[PDB]
Amino acid sequence: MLIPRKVKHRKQHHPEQRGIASGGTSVSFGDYGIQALEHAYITNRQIESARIAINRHIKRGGKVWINIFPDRPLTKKPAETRMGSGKGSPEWWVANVKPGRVLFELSYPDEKTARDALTRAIHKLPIKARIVTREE
Amino acid sequence: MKTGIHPEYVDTTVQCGCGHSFTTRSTKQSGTIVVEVCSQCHPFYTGK
Amino acid sequence: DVRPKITLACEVCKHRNYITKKNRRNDPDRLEIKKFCPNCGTHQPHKES
Amino acid sequence: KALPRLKQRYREEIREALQQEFNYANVMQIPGVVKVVVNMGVGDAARDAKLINGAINDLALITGQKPEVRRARKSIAQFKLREGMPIGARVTLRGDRMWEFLDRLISIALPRIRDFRGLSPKQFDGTGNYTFGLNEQSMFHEIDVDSIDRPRGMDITVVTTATNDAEGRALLRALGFPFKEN
Amino acid sequence: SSSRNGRDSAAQRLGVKRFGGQVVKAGEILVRQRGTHFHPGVNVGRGGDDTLFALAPGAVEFGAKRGRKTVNIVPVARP
RNA sequence: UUGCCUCCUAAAAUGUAACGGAGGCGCCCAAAGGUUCCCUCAACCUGGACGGCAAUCAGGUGUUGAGUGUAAGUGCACAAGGGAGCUUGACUGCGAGACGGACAUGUCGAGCAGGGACGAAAGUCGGGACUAGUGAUCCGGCACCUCUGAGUGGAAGGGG
RNA sequence: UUUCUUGCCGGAGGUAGAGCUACUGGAUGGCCGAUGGGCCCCACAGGGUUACUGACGUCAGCCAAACUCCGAAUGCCGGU
Ligand SMILES: [Mg+2]
Ligand SMILES: [Mg+2]
Ligand SMILES: [Mg+2]
Ligand SMILES: [Mg+2]
Ligand SMILES: [Mg+2]
Ligand SMILES: [Mg+2]
Ligand SMILES: [Mg+2]
Ligand SMILES: [Mg+2]
Ligand SMILES: [Mg+2]
Ligand SMILES: [Mg+2]
Ligand SMILES: [Mg+2]
Ligand SMILES: [Mg+2]
Ligand SMILES: [Mg+2]
Ligand SMILES: [Mg+2]
Ligand SMILES: [Mg+2]
Ligand SMILES: [Mg+2]
Ligand SMILES: [Mg+2]
Ligand SMILES: [Mg+2]
Ligand SMILES: [Mg+2]
Ligand SMILES: [Mg+2]
Ligand SMILES: [Mg+2]
Ligand SMILES: [Mg+2]
Ligand SMILES: [Mg+2]
Ligand SMILES: [Mg+2]
Ligand SMILES: [Mg+2]
Ligand SMILES: [Mg+2]
Ligand SMILES: [Mg+2]
Ligand SMILES: [Mg+2]
Ligand SMILES: [Mg+2]
Ligand SMILES: [Mg+2]
Ligand SMILES: [Mg+2]
Ligand SMILES: [Zn+2]
Ligand SMILES: [Zn+2]
């Protein structure tokens, strides 16, 4: 799981989830990547599942870059409780994703296996994404 | 150069043991010193 | 108290003109300062009451 | 009508030496010595405040001037050291007291070393400001031996207008300083 | 079950009180602030709590003087 | 939890709610107040017996990353930060004009006079870099005053 | 007419956006390579070899209500 070692403030507001990804929209580390198309909260659960999916599919040798970090905490007040008594305790972690941001990036020799591992990862995410290549 | 706060300082006569005469100034209230090992006595200074 | 209220009185007319504070731990003795006396008309010593 | 002797010999022969073997465009570029600083860094006086007294006394007798008491401008938990505690004592010497102290050291006190083997020529801070220490105040004949109480070292710094260790070393040798020959 | 916070202080109503080109009386206070965000300019004085006020009648106008935002009072001509 | 102060929410004037998100306050300093003058840190490299990255010394690089009694914010290197001298303005009589405001509170203020401090002088000084460190009225105490004093003189009691 | 609207003029902001080698924090992968890790000759000197861990630094891509080298539109104050 990806968890920040510390955050200055542990109870923030929900990340504003509007607009198009301005920063981080290109594939730079590896040759193939997964590039997003919808706003969402990608938790570290989703990221871990997707990374393990890619590693299971390729399983030999190739680099997976998770160039998004879940470092924004969503809190949840304990069950069966009414409204009030202050904000809850943080208990899951999130990356704020805009349409445009390359989420995962992969470097691997062949084409079809790389594409299939990337779509295997895509299926684990709460959004629509597409496979994007290192060239325009 | 303050009024009197510094220690006493006067000219002094320093004579070596091996015959050298040093004309100096120090805080010696006497103003007279004789030294048996000097700049011409040590084996390292004059190679002996 | 450690910083109690104190009063200052002019010596030459014994009128209490000012009230201030001071630390008793740090100023055990009566505090005296040259203050202004309205009826003496000039600056006079003022001593703690 | 009266001048220190070692400054006389300096001007007379060392200036031409430095000029002719370092070849300065400007005669004022011929270097020289500027000041000396003697520091007794006592430091362990964080408990015994009374040792700095002997420090300043013996340093005054050797140097001829009364040290400024150097306090500590930091608070640190370890050494039982708080801000504003006298830690060391320093005197700067310039001019005639300068030259006369240099005499009392190099012609008198520095010979009085037990097990002398010279002073390392690699003792410069990159630009020729030569600084060496020691660990006994009993090489100065201004102080009798039994009259001491603890074995203390000074901190002798000669600050000169050298551009690098070459000018500094050429100057110190020319002034008659018995270095270590590595 | 309880919030360990929920305290705040009163708003002190700080900020610029007279803007550029505004005619003021001598003595009017012109900007309330904490530090010296606006430094006193020509014919403008500074109060104890860093409150800038006008030392002469005229028109307010801001400026920059050696990398310091300053407030000045300009003498309008007498009609 | 209840009064006060600072920040974010709070949507670039001000103001803005919730058992919204974080902390402080109920002091301290006769200097940590006034003035006059002087200085620039923290960190880093190099050279030094204890002494170690680290303590004090020397050389250099170093425009602010240090420090500012005390939360936070706005400030401050022109220094508001560091050092010394003298000294009590941590004044009395006042106050043009304003900020803020249901009201009651609160906040700034040039300038005049008395009597002073520092400064050659210019000038600055009505506590503290700033914004917390507080409690209306009633009722009573105390010191001073040129007020009153139940027929009159005192007194008691009241008044400022 | 002091009100309100529209045009023009004089202002002060730190929001949207953005940026971060401009600060405070988070944070991805490389690169060199310490100090501290182990070993040889053999000393705990010294030297080099080694998955070393890999300070600092640096390359490229990023993130923030209580970050800001920056930074609008509107609104607000005044004038005309
Ligand atoms: Mg928003
Ligand atoms: Mg992008
Ligand atoms: Mg960006
Ligand atoms: Mg999917
Ligand atoms: Mg005292
Ligand atoms: Mg506030
Ligand atoms: Mg003030
Ligand atoms: Mg606002
Ligand atoms: Mg607004
Ligand atoms: Mg409201
Ligand atoms: Mg509390
Ligand atoms: Mg002060
Ligand atoms: Mg003072
Ligand atoms: Mg230095
Ligand atoms: Mg100061
Ligand atoms: Mg007072
Ligand atoms: Mg009024
Ligand atoms: Mg006067
Ligand atoms: Mg005044
Ligand atoms: Mg005040
Ligand atoms: Mg009642
Ligand atoms: Mg009667
Ligand atoms: Mg009567
Ligand atoms: Mg009476
Ligand atoms: Mg108009
Ligand atoms: Mg305009
Ligand atoms: Mg503007
Ligand atoms: Mg803001
Ligand atoms: Mg934004
Ligand atoms: Mg942070
Ligand atoms: Mg912002
Ligand atoms: Zn001899
Ligand atoms: Zn009096």
Short mmCIF file of N, CA and C (backbone and C1' of nucleotides) in Angstrom, two decimals, chain F residues 7-9 11-14 20-22 65 73-74, chain G residues 12-15 65-68 72-76:
data_model
loop_
_atom_site.label_atom_id
_atom_site.label_comp_id
_atom_site.label_asym_id
_atom_site.label_seq_id
_atom_site.Cartn_x
_atom_site.Cartn_y
_atom_site.Cartn_z
P C F 7 -5.87 36.40 12.20
"O5'" C F 7 -5.61 35.04 11.44
"C5'" C F 7 -4.31 34.73 10.97
"C4'" C F 7 -4.15 33.27 10.65
"C3'" C F 7 -5.11 32.68 9.64
"O3'" C F 7 -4.79 33.03 8.31
"C1'" C F 7 -4.83 31.18 11.44
P C F 8 -5.94 33.15 7.20
"O5'" C F 8 -6.46 31.66 7.02
"C5'" C F 8 -5.92 30.82 6.02
"C4'" C F 8 -6.58 29.46 6.05
"C3'" C F 8 -8.01 29.38 5.54
"O3'" C F 8 -8.08 29.35 4.13
"C1'" C F 8 -7.81 28.14 7.54
P U F 9 -9.25 30.14 3.36
"O5'" U F 9 -10.57 29.31 3.69
"C5'" U F 9 -10.70 27.95 3.27
"C4'" U F 9 -11.84 27.26 3.96
"C3'" U F 9 -13.22 27.84 3.71
"O3'" U F 9 -13.77 27.36 2.51
"C1'" U F 9 -12.93 27.41 6.02
P A F 11 -12.03 34.18 0.58
"O5'" A F 11 -12.59 33.10 -0.44
"C5'" A F 11 -12.20 33.10 -1.81
"C4'" A F 11 -13.37 32.94 -2.74
"C3'" A F 11 -14.16 34.20 -3.05
"O3'" A F 11 -13.55 34.92 -4.10
"C1'" A F 11 -15.62 32.35 -2.68
P A F 12 -13.38 36.51 -4.04
"O5'" A F 12 -12.36 36.75 -2.85
"C5'" A F 12 -11.04 36.27 -2.92
"C4'" A F 12 -10.03 37.33 -2.58
"C3'" A F 12 -10.53 38.75 -2.69
"O3'" A F 12 -11.23 39.20 -1.55
"C1'" A F 12 -8.54 38.57 -3.88
P A F 13 -12.39 40.26 -1.77
"O5'" A F 13 -12.08 41.39 -0.70
"C5'" A F 13 -10.85 42.10 -0.72
"C4'" A F 13 -10.97 43.42 -0.03
"C3'" A F 13 -11.53 43.37 1.38
"O3'" A F 13 -10.52 43.12 2.33
"C1'" A F 13 -12.68 45.02 0.13
P U F 14 -10.71 42.01 3.46
"O5'" U F 14 -11.88 42.58 4.37
"C5'" U F 14 -11.67 43.69 5.21
"C4'" U F 14 -12.96 44.17 5.84
"C3'" U F 14 -13.77 43.13 6.58
"O3'" U F 14 -13.30 42.87 7.88
"C1'" U F 14 -15.19 44.38 5.18
P G F 20 -19.99 19.68 14.00
"O5'" G F 20 -18.99 20.83 13.54
"C5'" G F 20 -17.59 20.69 13.71
"C4'" G F 20 -16.87 20.77 12.39
"C3'" G F 20 -15.36 20.76 12.48
"O3'" G F 20 -14.81 19.48 12.68
"C1'" G F 20 -16.03 22.47 11.02
P G F 21 -13.68 19.31 13.80
"O5'" G F 21 -12.33 19.63 13.02
"C5'" G F 21 -12.13 19.18 11.69
"C4'" G F 21 -10.94 19.85 11.06
"C3'" G F 21 -9.71 20.01 11.94
"O3'" G F 21 -8.95 18.82 12.04
"C1'" G F 21 -10.13 22.03 10.83
P A F 22 -8.06 18.56 13.35
"O5'" A F 22 -7.25 19.91 13.53
"C5'" A F 22 -6.44 20.15 14.66
"C4'" A F 22 -5.48 21.29 14.41
"C3'" A F 22 -4.78 21.84 15.63
"O3'" A F 22 -3.69 21.04 16.05
"C1'" A F 22 -5.55 23.62 14.29
P G F 65 14.16 34.36 5.92
"O5'" G F 65 14.01 32.78 5.87
"C5'" G F 65 14.34 31.99 7.00
"C4'" G F 65 14.98 30.70 6.59
"C3'" G F 65 16.02 30.14 7.55
"O3'" G F 65 15.43 29.33 8.55
"C1'" G F 65 16.85 30.12 5.32
P G F 73 1.62 30.82 11.04
"O5'" G F 73 1.17 32.26 10.53
"C5'" G F 73 0.08 32.42 9.65
"C4'" G F 73 -0.58 33.76 9.82
"C3'" G F 73 0.20 34.96 9.32
"O3'" G F 73 0.05 35.15 7.93
"C1'" G F 73 -0.60 35.40 11.49
P U F 74 1.34 35.45 7.02
"O5'" U F 74 1.46 37.03 7.07
"C5'" U F 74 0.37 37.85 6.70
"C4'" U F 74 0.48 39.24 7.30
"C3'" U F 74 1.79 39.96 7.06
"O3'" U F 74 1.87 40.53 5.77
"C1'" U F 74 1.19 40.17 9.33
P A G 12 -2.62 49.94 -5.50
"O5'" A G 12 -2.49 49.37 -4.04
"C5'" A G 12 -3.27 49.95 -3.00
"C4'" A G 12 -4.00 48.90 -2.24
"C3'" A G 12 -3.73 47.50 -2.72
"O3'" A G 12 -2.49 47.03 -2.22
"C1'" A G 12 -6.04 47.78 -2.41
P G G 13 -2.04 45.52 -2.45
"O5'" G G 13 -2.91 44.73 -1.40
"C5'" G G 13 -3.15 43.35 -1.56
"C4'" G G 13 -4.52 42.96 -1.10
"C3'" G G 13 -4.80 41.48 -1.29
"O3'" G G 13 -5.66 41.01 -0.26
"C1'" G G 13 -6.31 42.74 -2.61
P G G 14 -5.30 39.66 0.52
"O5'" G G 14 -6.20 38.58 -0.22
"C5'" G G 14 -5.92 37.20 -0.10
"C4'" G G 14 -5.85 36.55 -1.46
"C3'" G G 14 -4.94 35.34 -1.52
"O3'" G G 14 -5.45 34.42 -2.47
"C1'" G G 14 -4.18 36.95 -3.04
P U G 15 -5.21 32.85 -2.29
"O5'" U G 15 -6.55 32.20 -2.84
"C5'" U G 15 -7.76 32.28 -2.11
"C4'" U G 15 -8.94 32.40 -3.04
"C3'" U G 15 -8.84 31.62 -4.34
"O3'" U G 15 -9.19 30.25 -4.19
"C1'" U G 15 -9.59 33.82 -4.79
P A G 65 -5.16 23.79 -2.83
"O5'" A G 65 -5.62 24.55 -1.52
"C5'" A G 65 -6.33 23.85 -0.51
"C4'" A G 65 -6.76 24.77 0.61
"C3'" A G 65 -5.78 24.94 1.75
"O3'" A G 65 -4.81 25.93 1.47
"C1'" A G 65 -7.98 24.63 2.58
P A G 66 -3.25 25.63 1.59
"O5'" A G 66 -2.87 26.13 3.05
"C5'" A G 66 -3.09 27.47 3.45
"C4'" A G 66 -3.24 27.58 4.95
"C3'" A G 66 -2.26 26.75 5.76
"O3'" A G 66 -1.01 27.40 5.94
"C1'" A G 66 -4.44 26.36 6.54
P C G 67 0.35 26.56 5.85
"O5'" C G 67 0.49 26.22 4.31
"C5'" C G 67 0.53 27.25 3.34
"C4'" C G 67 1.73 27.12 2.44
"C3'" C G 67 1.99 28.30 1.53
"O3'" C G 67 2.66 29.35 2.19
"C1'" C G 67 2.26 26.27 0.35
P U G 68 2.32 30.87 1.85
"O5'" U G 68 2.94 31.06 0.40
"C5'" U G 68 4.33 30.85 0.16
"C4'" U G 68 4.67 31.10 -1.29
"C3'" U G 68 4.33 32.50 -1.78
"O3'" U G 68 5.26 32.89 -2.79
"C1'" U G 68 3.12 30.91 -3.03
P A G 72 -3.23 40.08 -11.46
"O5'" A G 72 -4.65 39.65 -10.92
"C5'" A G 72 -5.84 40.06 -11.58
"C4'" A G 72 -6.12 39.25 -12.82
"C3'" A G 72 -7.53 39.37 -13.36
"O3'" A G 72 -7.73 40.54 -14.13
"C1'" A G 72 -6.94 37.10 -13.26
P A G 73 -9.00 41.46 -13.82
"O5'" A G 73 -10.23 40.56 -14.24
"C5'" A G 73 -10.40 40.16 -15.58
"C4'" A G 73 -11.68 39.38 -15.73
"C3'" A G 73 -12.88 40.02 -15.07
"O3'" A G 73 -13.52 40.97 -15.90
"C1'" A G 73 -12.69 37.79 -14.36
P U G 74 -14.53 42.04 -15.27
"O5'" U G 74 -15.74 41.16 -14.74
"C5'" U G 74 -16.73 41.72 -13.91
"C4'" U G 74 -17.14 40.77 -12.82
"C3'" U G 74 -17.54 41.42 -11.52
"O3'" U G 74 -18.86 41.90 -11.52
"C1'" U G 74 -16.04 39.66 -11.08
P G G 75 -19.10 43.46 -11.30
"O5'" G G 75 -19.08 43.62 -9.72
"C5'" G G 75 -19.91 42.80 -8.90
"C4'" G G 75 -19.30 42.58 -7.54
"C3'" G G 75 -19.00 43.83 -6.74
"O3'" G G 75 -20.13 44.35 -6.07
"C1'" G G 75 -17.13 42.42 -6.69
P C G 76 -20.29 45.93 -5.93
"O5'" C G 76 -19.13 46.34 -4.93
"C5'" C G 76 -19.08 45.83 -3.61
"C4'" C G 76 -17.83 46.29 -2.91
"C3'" C G 76 -17.59 47.78 -2.94
"O3'" C G 76 -18.34 48.49 -1.97
"C1'" C G 76 -15.61 46.66 -3.54
#
